[PDB]
Amino acid sequence: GSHMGVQHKLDIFLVSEGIAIKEANLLKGDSYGCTIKIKLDKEKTFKFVIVLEPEWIDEIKPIYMKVNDESVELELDYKDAIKRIYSAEVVLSSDSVINLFSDVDVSYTSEYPTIKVNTIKKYYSVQNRGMTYVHIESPINTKDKSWKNGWYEDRT
Ligand code: NI
């Protein structure tokens, strides 16, 4: 009746590493984010797709991205009544910290998941699940790749 609170749904995909970060959403609370720590010995482009299915309230907090504490613009690829899909590509050349946040309150951010991706050795882990039941799959499942195969038609 009242104990449910705000339950946002968040999934974060490293499409360029074939890593899905499934259900990084706080189990309860009007906030979303994730700290991804990257072990990297050479130059590579990382492509991020973030899928937000916000709780049915009518004031959705925007999501932001920092890379090594530098703000990076998220493209909004898709928005409807259900979900927002954002994307970014960035180049990194050494051990990096990706921060997705909606908030700066330590009382929110300390509850976001902390994820480790090791490109060198092809290792990942949940260092800290925060206040989430986050989990990971590699490769990404085709039935999660939601962003047509029947021949063309003459539109004048
Ligand atoms: Ni309740």
From Swiss-Prot:
Source organism: Myxoma virus (strain Lausanne)
Pfam family, one: Pox_C7_F8A
Entry protein name: Probable host range protein 2-1
Keywords attached to this entry: Early protein
Cited function: Plays a role for multiplication of the virus in different cell types.
Disulfide bonding pattern of the chain: none
Membrane spanning residue stretches: none
One of the GO biological process terms: viral process
Family to which the UniProt record says this protein belongs: Belongs to the poxviridae C7 protein family.
